[PDB]
């Protein structure tokens, strides 16, 4: 296994923040999450797709990373980059953001 997250990072209100994650096995789809809500999906065969709850302020970042624009005090919390791989299974990583 391999779990290499960006770490517990912080940014100011109004600005933007980049969420990085790095994984040995074929990556089928990477799911981004704001605590329990789904932020985005990066499917290997179908590409990047943003949730209707975040199309207005979330754009695909570099590689399999994400960019959360127009920050607010409510965006503080856990963030998860789920890696659904084959045959290794699912690998998850945690990232805490403060604002």
């Amino acid at each position: 296994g391999t779990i290499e997250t960006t770490g517990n990072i912080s940014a100011e209100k109004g600005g933007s923040i980049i969420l990085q994650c790095h994984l040995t096995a074929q990556v089928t789809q990477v799911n981004w999450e704001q605590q329990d809500q789904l932020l985005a999906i990066c499917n290997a065969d179908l590409g990047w797709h943003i949730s209707p709850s975040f199309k207005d302020r979330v754009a695909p970042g570099p590689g399999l990373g994400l960019t959360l624009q127009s920050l607010t005090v409510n965006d503080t919390g856990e963030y998860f980059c789920i890696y659904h791989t084959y045959p290794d299974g699912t690998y998850t990583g945690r990232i805490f953001l403060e604002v």
Partner: antibody, heavy 126, light 114 residues
Framework: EVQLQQSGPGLVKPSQTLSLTCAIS??????????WNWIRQSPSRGLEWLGK?????????DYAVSVKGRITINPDTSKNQFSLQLNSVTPEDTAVFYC????????????????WGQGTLVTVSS | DIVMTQSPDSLAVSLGERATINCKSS????????????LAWYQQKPGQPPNLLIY???TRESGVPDRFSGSGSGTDFTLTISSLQAEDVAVYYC?????????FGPGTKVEIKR
Amino acid sequence: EVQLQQSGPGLVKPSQTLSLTCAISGDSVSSNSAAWNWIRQSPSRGLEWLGKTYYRFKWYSDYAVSVKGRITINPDTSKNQFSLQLNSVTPEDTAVFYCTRESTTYDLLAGPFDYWGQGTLVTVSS
Amino acid sequence: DIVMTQSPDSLAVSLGERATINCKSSQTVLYSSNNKKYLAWYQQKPGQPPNLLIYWASTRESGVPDRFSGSGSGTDFTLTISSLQAEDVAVYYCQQYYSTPFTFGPGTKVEIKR
């Protein structure tokens, strides 16, 4: 084509819970190209989205702010159906409740409601 | 939330004549990355659920006749019926599927002048 059959009682006493089911035929509940939504309609509020359940590589749920804390939409993979549970029902919840399929083929997280159930008239009265 | 509005509350048109109904979103439903308008049109006949007519602002759904068509873009949308038939009498709604919550317009009742 996809067929959606609705079931569950229409009459609900105030404060008690409304529970309806939407049985699917012609598609799966865990489909990556679909989301399973509940919409309501009344002459006072028109058409209003209530919530949805979708499985991409994990089960997810998104609900309207006007019902968060009362609403629950859970799938059943073995029975190929999705439920609606509205707790603490008030006379304002009286509406025709429709279950519908959101066709998310091009954009996997967004699409129009291409198929709808017959509708269930829900009356809130003692 | 995106508020959807429809300019004609009701419209009465003679049999075989054109009927155009307008729709407007408070924000643009055009997503740049794929150049798609997240807007749909529905027809609801009395006592039955709404039927999808158009999606992506201009794409006709399978099985819906050629007389129904969608145009307009970004924020202002227009559903047209080139020749209104007797069976086309219904309330027609527009909806945005761009941001949560997905919202519908107030509806436009299309009726026949005879």
